[PDB]
């Protein structure tokens, strides 16, 4: 609720004075330990999250008057701060107490107060030195107690809550990195370092576009209701005192002749804008496109002195939006509304920005409403989405006044006439972020240093633009292509266009096509594009002609197709190229860019005719990091949070990790993950809100939410892709894993987890080959590696490759390898390589086909390790004695890991507990007895069969018991209920529940026989020994 | 040589990265969690302030092979050709030398 | 089809309007199909999105989306699957652009709701463009629901009433695999054929119910030639004791102790193969144990899938598997599987190989697809792929052995003493207490088919 | 429907056929109830076009099918005590979706 506010410098944890009217609402509560949350106006969209504070009553405070410590925030109220705030006293809920919190103390404080051996005395000293009371004080994260010497870092479970000296978790940490030294409150920097006091007329200062709109309720002093709202600029109070002018005054900004007026106010502390700077809306900046530093001088012109104009000629600024016939009506209506709002201030040659919600374009709404103020309150029912530009071409005055150059426009007295269109370059993104100021869908800001392709493409436009200005014409064209969709190549095109402040001419191929089959398609398309261009291009250069999904039109066609279609395609393409050439010629400086999903599909002729050809690849690790930063940015998160509460995530998120797991995705996937995290956050927040009734302030997103969102997105992507072999496996399902844990982890994940260390041009571990009794878990262990480490998996059985004579065997391994290269990261498995990798050189087969296969696999396995990081080869053998020795060499296989018969009872114990982890076992089961019972010759598959047979036996017992129940109850009740009916409704839970006894396992074990003969065990051990020896 | 060097450049300071910043002290009435969860994060949850990359550090030192390394590699690396293959192909090369192989 | 989605959406629209104040724009896709021209439509979607925005929040809905926006069925014949874009695909892209632009512009206001009959049928573009967050499939109704469906259906005709002895629970038991439309049609049938005989005061009867069901042909089974009526029972086949026990342990045991297997937490054994001597009864014991279980039976022979086109055969396999899965608990059977999915490397065009991987996708595909009881027979199992016989991956296989003295006597006694379907007495004029023992002696090495043929020609003599 | 169609290809075909049947039936039916609407070789219009055919014709056939179904439903709703009978020489051809929607066989 709206309550007056003032700042006292009594300390961060000093009590907050509350006016008695505020105190009354607490009422039944203690009335002495009153706690209230606050929200402070934020200079831009969104609201500062409410901070909870301990308050005390004070009648001296006037009606609805409160006092809060400014030092609590990083500033003291030297200059005036916000007059008001939004206060809320929580009545039903009480202040939560944070069990754990994080702090920071300077080195000297650590080494001095730590001297005491007792923590209670130290915390008592902390209370004395900081006025913090247990069960009385509330602590927030990122709170500063000493000016660069005391810090609060983190709080748990919540980021703020009541303090309990004894029971609370408190972290005693120091500042050994000298970070606290630089920590200082805003406005605390200057110990009144007296700036030069003078009556200087002009003071050259730097200019900055307003990051976001400023609400009028923050104008101290408040201005008049009817004052025009489009001519305001702001800065620190010190600048005004240097100009010895007051907030709400008129001051003239001039640079090399071009001058304008502006209404100037002060920025209420706390700050957040660069000091010694002048902030102006785009209105001012546009007139100063090339001026960052500009001169500012006082003004003595009074409001009454401003002349009133009668007729003003305005030439609409040339622009892509301006040429849309679909919008002319709505743009004109919003234009007329903009003047009808109130008296306008303008000068000759001035520019006018107008914003409108294009979605409301075709719906001409309530124009017959004569001079109705209600139009204001459709505005929030509207939301302006896109902007257009206007040029002050001429103003007509009827009397010579003091302020002849400037002038005022009144709808009841001033007439306006639209005129021809005038060209004007759009402001570069550097001078202002129009989307951000107007709160549109801000386009992701690249860091050119991390997006080399974007840098390369940009390195084209400005050079062309300069050479054109330098009198050098050159038809600079470029075509974007990619191997996968959903990469935002159009987004990067828009980003580049705004970066250079160049007009954009976007034409979706998949929007205006008509019938591209009849003998009109070529003509209709060419005419439509030509019309959409000629109407804007003459007054819009420099700009770019962008064709989205250009390939859709230019479809290369095979001969056997209908010849007429071939001819029509040849036309469409040739005249398309001719139109491009004519466009380039007629208007020098224009450049053409096209977006294509597949570079190859474009006809070769035009492609050659194209100048620059660039592919946009999938985002990389650091690129994913930047994308996550962008989306998770509060500005990106709160674009459309109409609900008052803001959204945000805890600082404890390891963005680097989320990037890591973000491999093999696209920007839309990342946006989907972020919005899914938004889902989970809002859902859980509303759940808690109904549960407890207290709002944990804003909404938060936890790393688990994003992890699960990426999991689900990857599941959908996988269903889209071929790889079906990553469903679900973990270590709990398989034992016998600890024996080679170190080797497997070092071989697999270390190169992935430390590539820069492996970027030494070193042979990355080629692969792993496993051998031993079948069913021991070799394939299961490989699947565990794949699923835990999340690499695309395909299983290939060597024997399946062999054909009658040689249909296709080498080509097949080549296809699997290349498709693996597409689906990086990935893991490839060969089942029974011995059946495809036998010892060669001694025997002579019939045809010798296999020799080339083994040579090819050797050569490929050696050729991938050099650079092909992310793809790894693993083979499976059960009779390695047949395996060719050439593979045993490092480079083909270096870690000949083994998975043998379970010798010790621990192996069988782990295997059985992993197998029956999800069995509904009676307590009688004592698996040690079974492990001793099982001869060591039993393998993992033997244990799987054992568990399955024990389930079968137990289900048989339960079935016999159920049949006995059925018969008994049948005789008792006199009817004949079918088993199905008995199970649908008569069956209670115990009927549907399965109970397992040790007797079932004993029966299964007695029924099971060695899957491997002891002679086979000795053969396997001998083969092991012989291979391990060398 | 690189296997030898794995104890020459990796031995530097602590395991690759930054360490030896330890934990200072605690005040809990039972909550004695000193693990990295509240150690790596919190104080320095970011590895460094706005962490990024820098000049060559991971592979600063090349594992320059030594005369002993080459000596032992020679003996470890067995001949890739059996004498039977050598003599057979040489004899066949002479047989075609009677006609073409040579002059 | 037939799950009454349309009414689901109408009831929805009603509830959402009454409870949460969302402007809703219902529009069936049939009308748009009426004039599915790109520009004309583009205009309509503009109008829609504009109006829907005009009332924030809004909700679009389109029953039968596939009708208009449904991408032509994947292949559709043209090798140029890429490069060129189907008109409806362009329309979907247009709609996507508008709605997603508004969404980023305003998540709250507009929330579309599509309605289709299959994920693949619906154009995948929306999926690839991440337009759809999550989807729900309307499964066939359950018996417990069918109770209330019928209790409201014949309520609609308030005149008719059930019988005291009969109960809605019955209706649920016999009814199955019937969508609400199917239950509607069945109740209309029962009302009409009840009005046939005007003796009772429109009271249900067991006999009219049975006659109606017998005459009934539900949509799911409609349009399919289910070769099920064979009437081969235990009495028709008595030998192969081990095969009988294994088949009971596989088929009858689940249907007879479902409660126990419900929590049996390994995935149940999918199905078993049959092999043995030609004509040795592999086609017979399967049907006999199917009747034992009373489960749904389908006999699929090698040819049914095989076709002329390449790629179309795979989709024929696809909807074959769709039908098979739709009828849990059902038995699917493939005869002459040696002519269906042999070992790879036995085809120049490789259509056999791709077909085989297609088949493997389903069984190896862990999608809760286990109610269908897969089955197959072949006299030449050697010709099948080993992967199709991997233990654990696939279940046991059943051998058929030579009928020796014991088995020969068993089969001879069974067939000679067979009670007729038309008459009930012996199928043959059976010697009351002749010496059937000596007959088996001279039939060493025969086959049950040979034994029955011997008896048949003896009956002719 | 085997005789008077007078049009089977043109995209207007579906509209022409449906409009003609609707025109005649609503022209005569209102004053003639009770009555029966009979379609001879009804299948010759309704069928399940194979995927082995150009798409737009499949769309046209799906349309004509849907409007036939809507026509029968509208006629029965608007004219109580009215029924129809259809004749077909093979069940397999008629749209299964349509068949399910009907009552008697
Ligand atoms: N870093 C980014 N790169 C690309 N797109 C991004 C990025 N961040 C956000 N996006 C969003 O992803 C979408 C990119 O779509 P866009 O049409 O530009 O893709 P494209 O690569 O041309 O793909 P296609 O033509 O196959 O759909 C936009 O909605 C854009 O706002
Ligand atoms: N709540 C309900 N849900 C589903 N069906 C219902 C419901 N109540 C009644 N039914 C019956 O289900 C059938 C609904 O048919 P409907 O035409 O709506 O099918 P649909 O599955 O929506 O598909 P389509 O419109 O494409 O044919 C009718 O026979 C109706 O009597
Ligand atoms: N026990 C039996 N064993 C074999 N055939 C029997 C037996 N009892 C009856 N028959 C009759 O013998 C014939 C069995 O041939 P059937 O084709 O059904 O067998 P199959 O083993 O499935 O062979 P195939 O796969 O070659 O068709 C049928 O005519 C059946 O009526």
CB-CB under 8 Å, C107 with A994: no
* Dihedral angle of Cα A745, A749, A750, A755, to the nearest 10 degrees: 170
Backbone phi and psi for residue A280, each to the nearest 5 degrees, phi listed first: -135, 145
Put simply, whether A123 touches B (Cβ < 8 Å) is yes
> Alpha-carbon Rg of chain B, whole angstroms?
29
Q: Provide the experimental method for this PDB entry.
A: cryo-EM
Ligand nearest to the CA of A632: 1
On the CB side of A817, CA atoms within 13 Å amount to 17
Task: Report the C-alpha gap between A493 and A490 in whole angstroms.
Answer: 5
Do A775 and A948 form a contact (C-beta atoms < 8 A)? Answer: no
Question: From residue C66, how far is each of A698, C85, D53 by CA, in Å?
Answer: 41, 16, 18
**SS3 sequence of chain B:** CHHHHCCCCCCCCCCCCCCCCCCCEECCCCCCCCCCCCCCCHHHCCCCCCCCCCCCCCCCCCCCCCHHHHHHHHHHCCCCCCHHHHHHHHHHHHHHHHHCCCC
Task: Report the C-alpha gap between A15 and A552 in whole angstroms.
Answer: 69
With a CB cutoff of 8 Å and minimum separation 6, the contacts of A24 are none
**Residue ranges of the alpha helices (H) in A872-1011?**
885-888, 905-915, 927-933, 940-973, 979-981, 998-1007
Q: For residue A132, which of A161, A105, A159 has the smallest C-alpha distance?
A: A161
First to last CA, chain B: 45
- Kindly give the distance from the C-alpha atom of residue C5 to the centroid of ligand 2, in angstroms, as a whole number: 6
Backbone phi and psi for residue A16, each to the nearest 5 degrees, phi listed first: -100, 120
Q: Which of C34, C73, C188 is the closest to D103 by Cβ?
A: C188
Question: From residue A798, how far is each of A722, A890, C360, C383 by CA, in Å?
Answer: 20, 21, 18, 19
Q: Counting beta carbons within 10 angstroms of the beta carbon of residue A471, is it exposed (0 to 12), middle (13 to 18) or buried (19 or more)?
A: exposed
- Helix or strand run (H / E) with residue A672: helix A667-692
> Alpha-carbon Rg of chain A, whole angstroms?
38
Resolution, angstroms, 1 dp: 3.9
- Kindly give the distance from the C-alpha atom of residue A68 to the centroid of ligand 2, in angstroms, as a whole number: 64
| Mutation for testing the B interface, residue in A110, A113, A169 having most B CBs under 10 Å | A169
Instruction: Quote the DSSP letter at residue A771.
Output: B
Q: Which residues pair with C400 in a beta bridge?
A: C276
The DSSP code sequence of C41-88 is HHHHHHHHHHHHHHSSSEEEEBTTHHHHH----TTSS-S--SSS--HH
Nearest-CA distance C57 → chain D (Å): 32
Task: Look at residue C418 and give its three-state secondary structure.
Answer: coil
- Give the other-Cβ count within 10 Å of A90's Cβ: 17
For D59-97, b/e burial (b = at least 16 CB within 10 A) is bbbbbbbbbbbebbeebeeebeebebebebeeeeebbeb
Question: From residue C164, how far is each of A280, A978, C204, C336 by CA, in Å?
Answer: 86, 21, 9, 51
- Kindly give the distance from the C-alpha atom of residue A444 to the centroid of ligand 1, in angstroms, as a whole number: 10
Q: For residue A479, which of A600, A300, A349 has the smallest C-alpha distance?
A: A600
First to last CA, chain D: 20
Task: Report the C-alpha gap between A647 and A674 in whole angstroms.
Answer: 12
Q: Which of C73, C181, C309 is the closest to D100 by Cβ?
A: C181
CB-CB under 8 Å, B26 with A172: yes
* C-alpha triplet C275, C280, C286: angle, nearest 5°: 65
C439 token code pair: 């007959």
Report the residue among C376, C421, C448, C455 best suited for mutation to probe ligand 3: largest number of ligand atoms under 8 A from its CB: C448
- Omega before A652 within 30 of 0, i.e. cis: no
Q: Do chains B and D touch (3 or more CB pairs under 8 A)?
A: no
A667 in ligand 1 pocket by Cβ < 6 Å? yes
* Dihedral angle of Cα A404, A407, A413, A419, to the nearest 10 degrees: 100
Task: Report the C-alpha gap between A451 and A445 in whole angstroms.
Answer: 11
Do A509 and A549 form a contact (C-beta atoms < 8 A)? Answer: yes
Find chain C residues with C-beta within 8 A of A720's C-beta.
127-128
Task: Report the C-alpha gap between A513 and A523 in whole angstroms.
Answer: 11
Backbone phi and psi for residue D83, each to the nearest 5 degrees, phi listed first: -145, 165
Task: Report the C-alpha gap between C297 and C283 in whole angstroms.
Answer: 12
- Give the other-Cβ count within 10 Å of C149's Cβ: 22
Nearest-CA distance B15 → chain A (Å): 12
Q: Counting beta carbons within 10 angstroms of the beta carbon of residue A293, is it exposed (0 to 12), middle (13 to 18) or buried (19 or more)?
A: exposed
Q: Characterise C202 by phi-psi region: left (phi > 0), alpha (psi -120 to 50), beta (else).
A: left
Do A826 and A793 form a contact (C-beta atoms < 8 A)? Answer: yes
Instruction: Quote the DSSP letter at residue A247.
Output: T
CB-CB under 8 Å, A992 with C259: yes
Instruction: Quote the DSSP letter at residue C120.
Output: T
Backbone phi and psi for residue A254, each to the nearest 5 degrees, phi listed first: -130, 150
| Residue ranges of B 14-73 with Cβ closer than 8 A to chain A | 16, 21, 23-29, 31, 38, 41-45, 51, 58-59, 62
Instruction: Quote the DSSP letter at residue A375.
Output: G
A627 in ligand 1 pocket by Cβ < 6 Å? yes
Find chain B residues with C-beta within 8 A of A102's C-beta.
38, 42-43
Nearest-CA distance A824 → chain C (Å): 19
Task: Look at residue A842 and give its three-state secondary structure.
Answer: coil
Q: Counting beta carbons within 10 angstroms of the beta carbon of residue A146, is it exposed (0 to 12), middle (13 to 18) or buried (19 or more)?
A: middle
- Give the other-Cβ count within 10 Å of A226's Cβ: 9
Backbone phi and psi for residue A469, each to the nearest 5 degrees, phi listed first: -60, -35
- Nearest-CA residue for ligand 1 atom 23 is A486
Backbone phi and psi for residue A276, each to the nearest 5 degrees, phi listed first: 45, 45
Q: Are strands A386-397 and A351-356 parallel, antiparallel or unpaired?
A: antiparallel
Residue with tokens 């071409």: A393
Q: For residue A549, which of A493, A605, A590 has the smallest C-alpha distance?
A: A493
- Helix or strand run (H / E) with residue C272: strand C272-276
Q: Counting beta carbons within 10 angstroms of the beta carbon of residue C96, is it exposed (0 to 12), middle (13 to 18) or buried (19 or more)?
A: middle
CA C28, C33, C38, C43 torsion-angle sign? negative
Question: From residue D80, how far is each of A188, A509, D33, D36, D74 by CA, in Å?
Answer: 88, 52, 8, 12, 10
Question: From residue A853, how far is each of A828, A858, A860, A955, C345 by CA, in Å?
Answer: 17, 9, 11, 50, 17
* Chain C residue at shortest CA distance from D91: C223
Task: Report the C-alpha gap between A592 and C199 in whole angstroms.
Answer: 86
Do A579 and A529 form a contact (C-beta atoms < 8 A)? Answer: yes
CB-CB under 8 Å, A359 with C264: no
Instruction: Quote the DSSP letter at residue A426.
Output: P
Task: Look at residue A107 and give its three-state secondary structure.
Answer: helix
- Nearest-CA residue for ligand 1 atom 9 is A667
- Nearest-CA residue for ligand 2 atom 3 is C4
Q: Characterise A204 by phi-psi region: left (phi > 0), alpha (psi -120 to 50), beta (else).
A: beta
Task: Report the C-alpha gap between A783 and A725 in whole angstroms.
Answer: 8
Task: Report the C-alpha gap between A589 and A500 in whole angstroms.
Answer: 14
Do A1009 and A867 form a contact (C-beta atoms < 8 A)? Answer: no
Max CA-CA distance within chain A?
118
* Dihedral angle of Cα A247, A250, A253, A257, to the nearest 10 degrees: -170
Nearest-atom index, ligand 1, CA of A482? 21
Q: For residue A95, which of A157, A138, A143, A155 has the smallest C-alpha distance?
A: A138
Task: Report the C-alpha gap between A573 and A525 in whole angstroms.
Answer: 11
Q: Which residues pair with A594 in a beta bridge?
A: A479, A547
Do A55 and A16 form a contact (C-beta atoms < 8 A)? Answer: yes
- Helix or strand run (H / E) with residue A409: strand A406-409
Q: Do chains D and A touch (3 or more CB pairs under 8 A)?
A: no
- Give the other-Cβ count within 10 Å of C372's Cβ: 23
Q: Where are the beta strands (DSSP E) in A19-130?
A: 35-39, 51-57, 65-69, 84-89, 100-106
CA A614, A615, A621, A625 torsion-angle sign? positive
Task: Report the C-alpha gap between A206 and A293 in whole angstroms.
Answer: 4
Quickly count helices (H) and strands (E) in chain D. 3, 2
Task: Report the C-alpha gap between A756 and C271 in whole angstroms.
Answer: 51
Do A388 and A331 form a contact (C-beta atoms < 8 A)? Answer: yes
Q: Characterise A65 by phi-psi region: left (phi > 0), alpha (psi -120 to 50), beta (else).
A: beta
Quickly count helices (H) and strands (E) in chain C. 18, 7
Backbone phi and psi for residue A773, each to the nearest 5 degrees, phi listed first: -60, 145
Find chain D residues with C-beta within 8 A of C30's C-beta.
63, 66-67, 70
Q: For residue C183, which of C224, C216, C138 has the smallest C-alpha distance?
A: C216
The DSSP code sequence of A508-565 is ETTTS---TTSTTHHHHHHHHHHHHHHTTGGGT-SEEEEEETGGGT-----TTS-HHH
C87 token code pair: 């008109």
Q: Which of C33, C72, C219 is the closest to D100 by Cβ?
A: C219
CA A647, A650, A651, A652 torsion-angle sign? negative
Do A829 and A796 form a contact (C-beta atoms < 8 A)? Answer: yes
Backbone phi and psi for residue B35, each to the nearest 5 degrees, phi listed first: -65, 170
Do C233 and C419 form a contact (C-beta atoms < 8 A)? Answer: no
Task: Report the C-alpha gap between A632 and A677 in whole angstroms.
Answer: 10
Task: Look at residue C203 and give its three-state secondary structure.
Answer: strand
Q: Which of C76, C188, C222 is the closest to D99 by Cβ?
A: C222
- Helix or strand run (H / E) with residue A505: strand A503-508
Do A159 and A140 form a contact (C-beta atoms < 8 A)? Answer: yes
- Helix or strand run (H / E) with residue A481: strand A477-481
Find chain C residues with C-beta within 8 A of A948's C-beta.
266
**SS3 sequence of A971-1012:** HHHCCCCCHHHHHHHHCCCCCCCCCECHHHHHHHHHHCCCCC
CB-CB under 8 Å, A799 with C386: yes
Backbone phi and psi for residue A294, each to the nearest 5 degrees, phi listed first: -150, 155
What is the length of chain C? 461
Do A85 and A5 form a contact (C-beta atoms < 8 A)? Answer: yes
Do C193 and C208 form a contact (C-beta atoms < 8 A)? Answer: yes
- Give the other-Cβ count within 10 Å of A197's Cβ: 9
Q: Which residues pair with A255 in a beta bridge?
A: A258
Task: Report the C-alpha gap between A599 and A883 in whole angstroms.
Answer: 44
A219 token code pair: 């104008």
Q: For residue A187, which of A75, A315, A285 has the smallest C-alpha distance?
A: A75
Task: Report the C-alpha gap between A394 and A415 in whole angstroms.
Answer: 12
- Kindly give the distance from the C-alpha atom of residue C455 to the centroid of ligand 3, in angstroms, as a whole number: 14
Do A368 and A323 form a contact (C-beta atoms < 8 A)? Answer: no
Q: For residue C386, which of A695, A62, A798 has the smallest C-alpha distance?
A: A798
- Omega before A270 within 30 of 0, i.e. cis: yes
Q: For residue A956, which of A922, A995, A930 has the smallest C-alpha distance?
A: A995
The DSSP code sequence of C283-329 is HHHHHHHHHHHT-EEEEEEGGGT--SSSSHHHHHHHHHHHHHHHTSS
Residue with tokens 């401003």: A306
CB-CB under 8 Å, C72 with D52: no
Please enumerate, as own/partner, the contacts of A945-949 that have beta carbons within 8 Å and a separation of 24 or more.
Answer: A945/A1004, A945/A1008, A945/A1011, A946/A1001, A946/A1004, A946/A1005, A946/A1008, A947/A912, A947/A915, A947/A916, A947/A919, A947/A1004, A947/C266, A948/C266, A949/A1003, A949/A1004, A949/A1007, A949/A1008
Q: Where are the beta strands (DSSP E) in A226-298?
A: 232-235, 249-255, 258-266, 277-280, 293-298
Q: For residue C323, which of C366, C292, C369 has the smallest C-alpha distance?
A: C369
Ligand nearest to the CA of A670: 1
* C-alpha triplet C303, C309, C315: angle, nearest 5°: 75
CB-CB under 8 Å, B58 with A759: yes
CB-CB under 8 Å, A800 with C344: yes
CB-CB under 8 Å, C53 with A360: yes
Task: Report the C-alpha gap between C335 and C351 in whole angstroms.
Answer: 19
Please enumerate, as own/partner, the contacts of A238-241 that have beta carbons within 8 Å and a separation of 24 or more.
Answer: A238/A195, A238/A276, A239/A203, A239/A205, A239/A276, A239/A278, A240/A264, A240/A266, A241/A197
Quickly count helices (H) and strands (E) in chain A. 32, 33
CA A19, A23, A25, A26 torsion-angle sign? positive
For A574-587, b/e burial (b = at least 16 CB within 10 A) is eebbebbeebbeeb
Task: Report the C-alpha gap between C76 and C84 in whole angstroms.
Answer: 13
């Amino acid at each position: 609720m709206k309550a007056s506010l003032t700042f006292s410098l009594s300390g961060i944890y000093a009590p907050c004075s509350i006016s008695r009217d505020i105190y009354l609402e607490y009422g039944d509560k203690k009335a002495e330990c009153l706690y209230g949350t606050i929200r402070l106006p934020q200079y831009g969209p969104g609201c500062t999250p409410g901070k909870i504070v301990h308050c005390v009553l004070d009648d001296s405070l006037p009606f609805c008057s409160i006092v809060v410590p400014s030092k609590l925030f990083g500033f003291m109220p030297t200059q005036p701060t916000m007059d008001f705030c939004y206060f809320e006293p929580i009545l039903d809920n009480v202040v939560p107490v944070l069990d754990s919190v994080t702090f920071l103390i300077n080195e000297q404080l650590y080494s001095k107060l730590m001297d005491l051996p007792q923590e209670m005395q130290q915390i008592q000293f902390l209370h004395y030195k900081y006025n913090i009371n247990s069960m009385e004080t509330v602590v927030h994260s990122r709170d500063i107690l000493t000016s660069g010497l005391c810090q609060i870092l983190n709080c748990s479970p919540f980021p703020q809550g009541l303090v309990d000296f004894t029971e609370t978790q408190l972290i005693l940490v120091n500042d050994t990195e000298q970070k606290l030294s630089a920590l200082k409150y805003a406005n605390e920097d200057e110990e009144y370092a007296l700036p030069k006091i003078g009556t200087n007329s002009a003071l050259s200062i730097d200019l900055e576009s307003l990051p976001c709109t400023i609400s009028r309720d923050l104008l101290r002093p408040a201005p008049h209701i009817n004052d025009d709202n489009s001519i305001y600029a702001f800065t620190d109070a010190e600048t005004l005192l240097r100009l010895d002018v007051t907030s709400g005054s008129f001051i003239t900004v001039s640079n090399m002749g071009c001058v304008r007026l502006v209404k100037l106010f002060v920025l209420l502390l706390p700050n957040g804008f660069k000091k010694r700077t002048i902030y102006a809306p785009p209105k001012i900046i546009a007139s100063f496109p090339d001026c960052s530093v500009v001169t500012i001088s006082k003004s003595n012109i009074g409001h009454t002195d401003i002349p009133i104009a009668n007729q003003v000629f305005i030439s609409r600024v040339g622009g892509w939006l301006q040429s849309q016939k679909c919008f002319q009506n709505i743009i004109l209506t919003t234009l007329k509304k903009f003047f009808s709002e109130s008296k306008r201030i303008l000068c000759q040659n001035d520019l006018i920005p107008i914003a409108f919600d294009s979605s409301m374009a075709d719906l001409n709404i309530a124009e017959e409403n004569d001079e109705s103020d209600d139009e204001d309150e459709l505005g929030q029912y509207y939301k302006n989405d896109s902007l257009v530009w206007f040029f002050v071409t001429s103003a007509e005055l009827d009397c010579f006044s003091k302020d002849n150059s400037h002038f005022i426009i009144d709808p009841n007295r001033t007439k306006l006439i639209t005129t021809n269109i005038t060209n004007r370059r759009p402001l570069p993104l550097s001078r202002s972020n129009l989307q951000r100021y107007y709160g549109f869908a801000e386009t992701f800001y690249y860091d050119l240093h991390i997006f080399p392709y974007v840098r390369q493409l940009v390195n084209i436009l400005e050079t062309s633009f300069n050479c054109s200005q330098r009198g050098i014409t050159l038809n600079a064209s470029v075509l974007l292509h990619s191997t996968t969709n959903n990469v935002g190549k159009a987004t990067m095109v828009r980003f580049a266009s705004k970066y250079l402040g160049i007009h954009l001419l976007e034409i979706d191929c998949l929007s205006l096509t008509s019938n591209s089959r009849q003998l009109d398609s070529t003509s209709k398309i060419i005419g439509y594009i030509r019309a959409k261009c000629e109407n804007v291009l003459p007054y819009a250069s420099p700009a770019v002609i962008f064709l989205a999904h250009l390939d859709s039109i230019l479809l290369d066609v095979n001969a056997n197709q209908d010849p007429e279609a071939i001819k029509l395609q040849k036309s469409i393409n040739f005249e398309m190229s001719k139109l491009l050439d004519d466009f380039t010629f007629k208007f020098p400086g224009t450049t053409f860019v096209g977006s294509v999903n597949n570079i190859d599909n474009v006809p070769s002729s035009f492609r050659s005719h194209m100048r620059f050809e660039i592919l946009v690849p999938v985002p990389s690790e650091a690129q994913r990091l930047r994308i996550f930063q962008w989306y998770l940015s509060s500005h990106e998160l709160n674009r459309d949070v109409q609900q008052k509460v803001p959204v945000s995530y805890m600082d404890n998120i390891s963005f680097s990790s989320l990037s890591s797991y973000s491999a093999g995705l696209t920007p839309l996937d990342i946006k989907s993950i972020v919005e899914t995290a938004r889902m989970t956050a809002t859902a859980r927040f509303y759940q808690e809100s109904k549960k407890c009734g207290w709002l944990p302030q804003s909404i938060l997103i936890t790393q688990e939410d994003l992890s699960k969102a990426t999991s689900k997105a990857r599941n959908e992507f996988s269903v889209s892709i071929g790889a079906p072999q990553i469903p679900n496996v973990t270590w709990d399902d398989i034992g016998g894993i600890d024996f080679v844990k170190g080797e497997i982890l070092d071989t697999i994940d270390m190169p992935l987890k430390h590539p820069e260390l492996f970027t030494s041009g070193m042979k990355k571990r080629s692969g792993i080959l496993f051998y031993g009794p079948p069913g021991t878990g070799k394939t299961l262990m490989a699947k565990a590696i794949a699923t835990n480490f999340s690499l695309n998996f395909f299983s290939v059985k060597g024997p399946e490759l062999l054909n009658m004579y040689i249909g296709e065997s080498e080509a097949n391994v080549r296809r699997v390898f290349q498709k693996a290269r597409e689906a990086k990261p990935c893991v490839i498995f060969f089942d029974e390589i011995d059946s495809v990798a036998p010892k060669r050189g001694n025997q002579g087969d019939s045809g010798g086909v296999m020799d080339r296969i083994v040579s090819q696999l050797l050569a490929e396995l050696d050729g991938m390790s050099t650079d092909a990081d992310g793809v790894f080869v693993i083979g499976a053998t059960n009779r390695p004695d047949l395996l060719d020795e050439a593979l045993l060499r490092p480079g083909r296989f270096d870690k000949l890991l083994y998975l043998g018969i379970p010798d010790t009872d621990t192996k069988q114990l782990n295997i059985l507990e992993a197998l029956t982890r999800k069995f509904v076992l009676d307590n009688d089961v004592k698996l040690i007895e079974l492990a001793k019972l099982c001869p060591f010759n039993y393998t993992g598959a033997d244990f799987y069969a054992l568990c399955s047979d024990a389930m079968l036996n137990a289900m048989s017992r339960i079935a016999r018991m159920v049949e006995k129940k059925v018969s008994q109850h049948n005789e008792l009740t006199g009817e004949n209920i079918s088993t199905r009916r008995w199970f649908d409704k008569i069956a209670t839970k115990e009927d549907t529940k399965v109970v397992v006894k040790m007797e079932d396992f004993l029966k299964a074990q007695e029924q099971l026989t060695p899957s491997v003969s002891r002679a086979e065990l000795n053969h396997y051990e001998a083969v092991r020994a012989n291979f391990e020896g060398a | 040589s690189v296997h030898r060097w794995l104890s020459a450049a990796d031995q530097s300071e602590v395991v690759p990265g930054n360490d030896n910043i330890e934990y200072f002290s605690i005040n809990e009435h039972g909550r004695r969690e000193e693990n990295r969860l509240r150690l790596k994060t919190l104080l320095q949850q970011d590895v460094v302030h706005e962490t990024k990359t820098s000049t060559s550090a991971a592979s600063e030192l090349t594992a320059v092979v030594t005369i002993n390394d080459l000596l032992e590699a020679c003996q470890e690396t067995k001949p890739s050709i059996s004498t039977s293959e050598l003599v057979k192909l040489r004899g066949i090369y002479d047989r075609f030398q009677k006609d073409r192989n040579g002059e | 089809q037939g799950i009454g989605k349309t009414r689901l959406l109408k009831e929805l629209i009603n509830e959402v309007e009454k409870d949460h104040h969302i402007f809703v724009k219902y529009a069936d896709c049939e009308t748009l199909h009426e004039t599915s021209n790109l520009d004309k439509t583009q205009k309509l979607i503009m109008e829609w999105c504009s109006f829907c925005y005009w009332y924030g929040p809004s909700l679009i809905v389109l029953d039968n989306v596939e009708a208009l926006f449904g991408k032509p069925q994947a292949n559709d014949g043209d090798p140029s699957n890429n490069g060129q874009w189907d008109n409806a695909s362009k329309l979907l892209n247009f709609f996507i652009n508008q709605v997603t632009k508004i969404f980023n512009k305003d998540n709250k206001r507009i929330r579309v709701l599509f309605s289709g009959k299959q994920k693949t049928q619906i154009n995948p573009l929306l999926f690839d463009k991440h337009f759809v967050s999550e989807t729900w499939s309307l499964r066939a109704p359950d018996k417990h629901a069918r109770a209330k469906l019928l209790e409201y259906f014949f309520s609609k005709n308030q005149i008719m009433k059930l019988n005291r002895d009969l109960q809605f629970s019955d209706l649920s038991l016999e009814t199955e695999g019937f969508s609400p439309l199917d239950l509607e049609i069945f109740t209309e049938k029962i009302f009409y054929d009840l009005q046939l005989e005007r003796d009772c005061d429109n009271v249900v009867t067991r006999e009219l119910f049975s006659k109606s069901l017998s005459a009934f042909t539900p949509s799911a089974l409609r349009g399919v030639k289910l070769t099920k009526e064979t009437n081969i029972k235990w009495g028709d086949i008595g030998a192969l004791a081990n095969a009988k026990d294994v088949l009971l342990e596989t088929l009858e045991w689940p249907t007879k102790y479902e409660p126990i297997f419900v929590n049996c937490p390994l995935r149940l054994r999918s199905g078993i193969l049959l092999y043995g001597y030609p004509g040795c009864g592999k086609t017979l014991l399967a049907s006999a144990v199917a009747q034992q279980c009373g489960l749904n039976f389908i006999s699929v022979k090698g040819p049914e899938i095989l076709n002329k086109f390449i790629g179309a055969s795979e989709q024929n396999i696809r909807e074959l598997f769709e039908r098979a899965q739709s009828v849990k608990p059902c038995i699917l059977f493939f005869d002459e599987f040696d002519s269906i999915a042999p070992k790879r490397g036995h085809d120049s065009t490789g259509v056999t190989d791709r077909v085989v991987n297609q088949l493997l996708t389903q069984m190896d595909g862990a999608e809760g697809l286990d109610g269908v009881y897969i089955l197959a027979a072949t006299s030449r199992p050697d010709l099948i792929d080993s992967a199709l016989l991997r233990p654990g991956r696939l279940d046991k296989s059943v051998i058929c052995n030579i009928p020796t003295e014991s088995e020969r006597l068993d089969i001879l006694q069974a067939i000679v003493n067979s009670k007729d379907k038309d008459t009930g007495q012996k199928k043959f004029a059976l010697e009351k207490n002749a010496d059937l023992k000596l007959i088996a002696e001279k039939t060493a090495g025969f086959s049950g088919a040979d034994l029955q043929g011997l008896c048949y020609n003896a009956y002719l003599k």
